[PDB]
Design a binder for this molecule. Structure first.
Ligand SMILES: Nc1nc2c(ncn2[C@@H]2O[C@H](COP(=O)(O)OP(=O)(O)OP(=O)(O)O)[C@@H](O)[C@H]2O)c(=O)[nH]1
Ligand SMILES: Nc1nc2c(ncn2[C@@H]2O[C@H](COP(=O)(O)OP(=O)(O)OP(=O)(O)O)[C@@H](O)[C@H]2O)c(=O)[nH]1
Ligand SMILES: Nc1nc2c(ncn2[C@@H]2O[C@H](COP(=O)(O)OP(=O)(O)O)[C@@H](O)[C@H]2O)c(=O)[nH]1
Ligand SMILES: Nc1nc2c(ncn2[C@@H]2O[C@H](COP(=O)(O)OP(=O)(O)O)[C@@H](O)[C@H]2O)c(=O)[nH]1
Ligand SMILES: [Mg+2]
Ligand SMILES: [Mg+2]
Lengths: 52, 430, 442, 430, 442
């Protein structure tokens, strides 16, 4: 028997604190432990320019 | 790096119950199984002893086996009993009768397949398996017989892991059972072949610890099992907390055993001191070292003053300098040089861990390999020879099915173990 | 300037869902076929034409057909979110599956459905003015993909003739497996694909699982991840037709440069900057690092080790901010390496392409955003090891006729197994002879 | 793609009542026949098992047959009984008398034409017909005789469709009837010629599942029929819900049967666990795989450890990764390689479906083709040989009209089935 | 210009933490890999390039790998304060330790992990244009440091060839000890280290404890103090590559000037103004005082007495406000002393270096701030006494095969002990022969 929706939501809320759910989620890259900023053009060095 | 525990017989199940209380306290797990700790350092190695159950809960990696369910009903009724997985309690329907042959051959072969099934289901769940840890008494009936049977099966199935046993040896002054010498001799025969490291504890040394050091007026078995639980929970501390000089069970085995038969060790834990005296003297490494080598603090009847140390290990918990540890171990080796084996250039290994046991500023656990161990086996061998020459109670074991040649083989093997310790005590350069 | 896509069976339709999601998001077409008012202002462009055609009211509809014998996957497309994007006639579905039987798809059931498929492709091809090839997606492990893919390619090859047909095919991986009869279906499929395909790209799920574990940090991947990687590869190969660039590569130039002899048309594929956001911000990604990456076996999408063979031709496609001089310096450095070897009859081993449009990022995706990427398709003798392992599994089962009664019941002669096995044996001998290290002067 | 069900005899009718309760619950059909479900996914494949009557009601495509109306009146009187179409209940006026010959030859031929008329009326109304599904016992009287007769008639009329049977067979441990061996032998002779796939279940295995795994204190026939209804409703799940790797009854047959006589399979359902234990262990693909191959979870008395698997199939329901499924099936095949037939390079087929059964996060049903099924048939043949040498009760069957030559033919055919299974177990590749 | 750092085991990783803390604070890199102050045109610097590379967004990342077989120490680095500085691929960790067995590290466990390390070193060496050496930190007393350090040095020596390899090694102290099996591991390490290292600097913990008690005022020292001193020494030796100076010294000049014969490459190290803040403002610290200080045995970081041997070469590093004439006057005064002796075949016994950057002060450090410092590395025959005591302990233990059964079970046979002991005996004879005065000039 399932105790409805609130119990299920709290049950899933108590789950993610497990280390397995943190470093091994389903079909996803594990979350970062610090903030990252994606540049406007993307990652990597821009190509260096030269005089015409 | 996770360990799987097995608790066998009454003594083993009760010590295990106190051990799981102490370990659950150190990692802040409520008796309901909920994590309630107060530092991330507690959670980051919880996997070493616990498996994860649904919605927050943690379950302890232990198998309980006994031949009569009285003890199992007592531990299930205890304050932390609920944490244990129901399918992990295994019990039969008739007692061991204090008979090794009954416990090994008749009810043993009947239940043994189900215990190996539980150990394998639990072992194959681990991502990387470290050694097993087993608690049992050698003087009993189901403890000795089924413990050694299970040790043999796990050694056949996992020969590359570590095999560890904690064992409470029979006392020379007050026996609870008449046929203790037979059960002890057969069990030591099984252990010296199967085990990698075995720790031996008397009941008389723990009573002397309680009366002299703690000055308890009326000690009870809960205190005895607490003393055992402290050292048992202490040996694995470097597996599960950070430190300045890490150590491991395999590293302990490599540093302590010079030759494969000499793997029986004594245990001690140092900062035992009564509540009245504690206000007048602060903890420090010289004080810990002095209690650590005092024979009053060793939990085996044999006294170090009658032997020599081949090797010893000290694991320190707390924030302390490594210089103090190194210089203390050098000063103790130089000042007491006659009690240290002269061919090994340094007999003491040190280890330092950052996290002390709760409520103590510092603690050390001591493991010692000493040639005084011969005395304990000698007493039993003597009692065995007095009983065996007259066929005193052999018909029970022969009626179960044992051949007398097993008794003569076990006596010869134990006598050879005593001879090997005696030979290494009196070795010389020439 | 145009290409028609044919999707067959379960793997081909599910990979098609990821491909059309990507092509829509890259051009900017909404899921309902419209295009927002700000993409169509100030300038008038035709780049969508390779994959979409517009109606007179300005709705876009895509140039694809979906073929299946079971209704479930096409019914998922009919009831899902992209319901309004596809034309309903294009989504064709039968009543019952080919049940992992090549015989059921080819002889008994596909014979009823094939004429509707040919009528839809004909009605599409008549409404074109620069058709430049067919793209086909299918798996050779299953019954309908093998049988109906072969029958439809045979009919297409007679009706349209010289026009090129490029296939993306998922072959059975060397140790992960999903069904018992995979060797029989793969051998019988390969017999038909030899005569009726111009280039065949080989894929193995075990390689994409290894790539997703090693480069990205995903421990438990699912088919949507693999299908998004395949979609990125297809977008890289077809980008040369759709966007401006320094060195363009027409689909006929791939066939001219990669195939030395008419049977030697099976190619390996790899993709370089498969990377997560946390690694992407710790590293620069210059041309020389991704050029060195594409040649490591950890980057490949097929489970083969190229160190056990010799390369005959490589085609390297660069997209994004790259300048030709670094591509030339990179290729010269690769050519210097001692663990990379080319057959001595192929001295000029490389073809290059450079396009300015960088790869697109999908909202739920797992790849990072990067300024440049390179994709490679190459012809190498190492592929002969994959066929040898398929032949060993076929020989083990066929020595005792392990499952043949199903195939014989559905209409097939037992002789066809021996014919296909001898033809694939001849393909193995062709790869042994073509790869000869040297010929004697006497 | 719709299936037509036939339920015959007391055991078949009783299992069928529970099956239609489970199916009506999963698709949200009220026992009045009104749709009261909560997702469109339930309605979109309702045609597979139900026909639609005027208004809101849905009616189940099933034929009920029995020789005495007591059971049929009990099923019509049950809580979901009203949903069944009145014209679909066919019954006679006198019992089978536990006699195979009576059920097959005298009253069978009297009623059989009306059953074929109803089955043809139901089949020709379908837009595309998939296989038939029949539930009956082989040890009974009306179950054996009319089930095998009707199977023969449907196999004559629809040879291009699929033929599927679920059958309960007598165990020697707990027999309810003395003449079980005769009826079983004649029924297995009929099934091996007529059937495409036959599933076998032992009541002893269901009692051991209930007592050991579920720890039920007092299980009843409703529980055994619920476990069977669970597996029956699980095998067809890919026909009626979406998924990442679709499967079909014909795809199961093509992947599992190497040679046409080897079509007898074992059944299992994995997430069985007691209400006390459920809080202690989470569902996962390794856990499901471990229960799935455990002989404790199989519904026949023969154990896989005495034979080898020719082929097996696992159908998974739930949201899970394909990588973990493929590598678990590979690891099980590699580690226990001696139990898998070596001349087949991969013995396990996997399938994944998105929608689990209500109340479970994930579930798998397992179908296995293993040579250990020969021990069950051999046991029945032994009891037949003991009874036949003495003509123990033969006059009843001869009085109905059977020639003794049928008994020697049926024994020869069953003995040949056992020989064919035994030869592939004991063979080399050469 | 570039140098790559390899950290092995516990001592090497913990000393690495102090080294990278110091190098970051000296260049000005924040713990998260950033740069304060301005970045516009007008000024431009490059000194970081020896140890860091920058990404296109301007983050800096260091040229190091951290290698361990147990996870705890690298997980401490992953969860510590410098989490954002290192790339996660650089922090490599196995499952279980080498349990003080050289045999277990070399034969059983290191063989699986070694290929990832070589792949990381290859990816670093490809991102260089003037690599001039590898710096390696390890202890020979433990199992993984000995076994994996030897195996990795062998593979590095075959793959990279002529490139120099400089090791900083901690030997087991002559009476302070931590494990019983230290002599066996040190002999077996030294056998491999003899063939595959260009210069080896030797350290003993007992000397750094004595130096920290006598010169600094620390009564109860711990490993963080020793690691900060080692970091200062490595920073002093590598400063010549990174900053302007009067007399520079390239890493090839060390090998040319310090090693007379190819086997005589073990050197002693010492540092002069180790002083506390309260004493530093009561005294001047001129060049002649610190030059006299470096030759006193109270300054050395190795427990050996140089009066029992002869110097062959000395390399003196001066950093800070020093003038060459003061260095010349100091060296001439040292040369005058009667208790300092050089071999008669080495008349020009000294090499000098002068750099303008004064030593950095670390906020929680215990060293005072000083305007100048000198660091010395010297080659002397006295080192033969250090090996003799390890060999004596080996001979005592090996007489009973005291622990050999562990080593033989994990794969090392028994002859290898005798082989290694004979090689170290030959090294002792080499130091006896090189130090013997020439009998005659004819
Ligand atoms: N990458 C990828 N592989 C898939 C996908 N679906 C199935 N496969 C693989 O392809 C093989 C199965 O081929 P299917 O496409 O299921 O066969 P089919 O075309 O449906 O043929 P029938 O079963 O007769 O309908 C297995 O190796 C699966 O792992 C998918 O969506 N993506
Ligand atoms: N200076 C310094 N010496 C250390 C440190 N930790 C250990 N040592 C010394 O190094 C020797 C022990 O070597 P370890 O580094 O522990 O050996 P290991 O590399 O960990 O090898 P395994 O034990 O197999 O993991 C002893 O002489 C210790 O005194 C440290 O943090 N700093
Ligand atoms: N330390 C300790 N010893 C115990 C405990 N219970 C029993 N013993 C001792 O163990 C021996 C009896 O063995 P027992 O456990 O009854 O053997 P079993 O019948 O096989 O379980 C006697 O020496 C007892 O004194 C206990 O809780 N703690
Ligand atoms: N599992 C199960 N077995 C049943 C059920 N009812 C009867 N049986 C078994 O089936 C056998 C009796 O066969 P029966 O159905 O009476 O044969 P019939 O007289 O031809 O219908 C005995 O072994 C019973 O135990 C039921 O509801 N479930
Ligand atoms: Mg399909
Ligand atoms: Mg270590």
């Amino acid at each position: 028997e399932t105790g409805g929706r609130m119990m299920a939501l709290m049950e899933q809320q108590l789950e993610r604190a497990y280390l397995s759910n943190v470093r091994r989620p389903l079909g996803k890259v594990p979350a970062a432990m610090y903030d990252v900023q994606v540049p406007h053009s993307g990652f990597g060095i821009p190509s260096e320019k030269s005089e015409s | 790096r996770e360990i799987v525990c097995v608790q066998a017989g009454q003594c083993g199940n009760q010590i295990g119950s106190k051990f799981w209380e102490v370990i659950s306290d150190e990692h802040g797990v409520d008796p309901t199984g909920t994590y309630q700790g107060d530092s991330d350092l507690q959670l980051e190695r919880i996997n070493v002893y616990f498996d994860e159950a649904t919605g927050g809960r943690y379950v302890p990696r232990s198998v309980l086996i006994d031949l009569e369910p009285g003890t199992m009903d007592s531990v299930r009724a205890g304050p932390y009993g609920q944490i244990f997985r129901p399918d992990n309690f295994i019990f039969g329907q008739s007692g061991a009768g204090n008979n090794w042959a009954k416990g090994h051959y008749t009810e043993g072969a009947e239940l043994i397949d189900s215990v190996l099934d539980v150990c394998c289901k639990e072992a194959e769940s681990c991502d990387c398996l470290q050694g097993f840890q087993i608690c049992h008494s050698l003087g009993g009936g189901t403890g000795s017989g089924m413990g050694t049977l299970l040790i043999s099966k796990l050694r056949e199935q996992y020969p590359d892991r570590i095999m560890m046993t904690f064992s409470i040896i029979p006392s020379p002054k007050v026996s609870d059972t008449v046929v203790e010498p037979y059960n002890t001799t057969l069990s030591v025969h099984q252990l010296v072949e199967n085990s990698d490291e075995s720790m031996c504890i008397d009941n008389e040394a723990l009573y002397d610890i309680c009366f002299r050091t703690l000055k308890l007026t009326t000690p009870t078995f809960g205190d005895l099992n607490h003393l055992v639980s402290a050292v048992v929970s202490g040996v694995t501390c470097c597996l599960r907390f950070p430190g300045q000089l890490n150590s491991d069970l395999r590293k302990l085995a490599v540093n302590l055993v010079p030759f494969p038969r000499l793997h029986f060790f004594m245990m001690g834990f140092a900062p035992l001191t009564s509540r009245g005296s504690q206000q007048y003297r602060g903890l420090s490494v010289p004080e810990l070292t002095q209690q650590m080598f005092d024979a009053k603090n060793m939990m085996q009847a044999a006294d170090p003053r009658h032997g020599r140390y081949l090797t010893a290990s000290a694991l320190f918990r707390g924030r302390m300098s490594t210089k103090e540890v190194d210089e203390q171990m050098l000063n103790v080796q130089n000042k007491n040089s006659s009690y240290f084996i002269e061919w090994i250039p340094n007999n003491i290994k040190s280890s330092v861990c950052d996290i002390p046991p709760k409520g103590l500023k510092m603690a050390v656990t001591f493991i010692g390999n000493n040639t005084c161990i011969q005395e304990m086996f000698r007493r039993v061998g003597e009692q065995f020879t007095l009983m065996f020459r007259r066929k005193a109670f052999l018909h029970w074991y022969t009626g179960e099915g044992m051949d007398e040649m097993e008794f003569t083989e076990a006596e010869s093997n134990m006598n050879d173990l005593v001879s090997e310790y005696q030979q290494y005590q009196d070795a010389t350069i020439e | 300037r145009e290409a028609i896509c044919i999707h067959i069976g379960q793997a081909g339709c599910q990979v098609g869902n990821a491909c059309w999601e990507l092509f829509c998001l890259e051009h900017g077409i909404q899921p309902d076929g419209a295009m927002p008012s700000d993409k169509t202002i100030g300038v008038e462009d035709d780049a969508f034409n390779t994959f979409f055609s517009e109606t007179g009211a300005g709705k876009h509809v895509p140039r694809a057909v979906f073929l299946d014998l079971e209704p479930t996957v096409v019914d998922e497309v009919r009831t899902g979110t992209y319901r309004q994007l596809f034309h309903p006639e294009q989504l064709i579905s039968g009543k019952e599956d080919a049940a992992n039987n090549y015989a059921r798809g080819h002889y008994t059931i596909g014979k009823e459905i094939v004429d509707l498929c040919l009528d839809r492709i004909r009605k599409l091809a008549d409404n074109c003015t620069g058709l430049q090839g067919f793209l086909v997606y299918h798996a050779v492990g299953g019954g309908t993909g093998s049988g109906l893919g072969a029958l439809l390619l045979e009919r297409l090859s007679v009706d349209y003739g010289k026009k090129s047909k490029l296939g993306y095919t998922v072959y059975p991986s060397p140790q992960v497996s999903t069904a018992v009869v995979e060797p029989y279906n793969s051998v019988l499929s390969t017999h038909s694909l030899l005569e009726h395909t111009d280039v065949a790209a080989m894929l193995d799920n075990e390689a994409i699982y290894d790539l997703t574990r090693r480069n990205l940090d995903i421990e438990r991947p699912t088919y949507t991840n693999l299908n998004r990687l395949i979609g990125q590869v297809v977008s890289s190969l077809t980008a040369s037709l759709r966007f401006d660039g320094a060195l363009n590569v027409d689909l006929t130039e791939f066939q001219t440069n990669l195939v030395p002899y008419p049977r030697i048309h099976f190619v390996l594929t790899s993709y370089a900057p498969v990377i997560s956001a946390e690694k992407a911000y710790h590293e620069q990604l210059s041309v020389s690092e991704i050029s060195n990456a594409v040649f490591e076996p950890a980057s490949m999408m097929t489970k083969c080790d190229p160190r056990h063979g010799k390369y005959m031709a490589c085609c390297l496609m660069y997209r994004g901010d790259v300048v030709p001089k670094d591509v030339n310096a990179a290729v010269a450095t690769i050519k210097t390496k001692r663990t990379i070897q080319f057959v001595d009859w192929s001295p000029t081993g490389f073809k290059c392409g450079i396009n300015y449009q960088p790869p697109t990022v999908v909202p739920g995706g797992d790849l990072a955003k990067v300024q440049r990427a390179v994709c490679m398709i190459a012809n190498s003798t190492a592929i002969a090891e994959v066929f040898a392992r398929i032949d060993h599994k076929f020989d083990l089962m066929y020595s005792k006729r392990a499952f043949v009664h199903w195939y014989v019941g559905e209409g097939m002669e037992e002789g066809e197994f021996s014919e296909a096995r001898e033809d694939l044996a001849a393909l193995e001998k062709d790869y042994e002879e073509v790869g000869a290290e040297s010929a004697d002067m006497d």
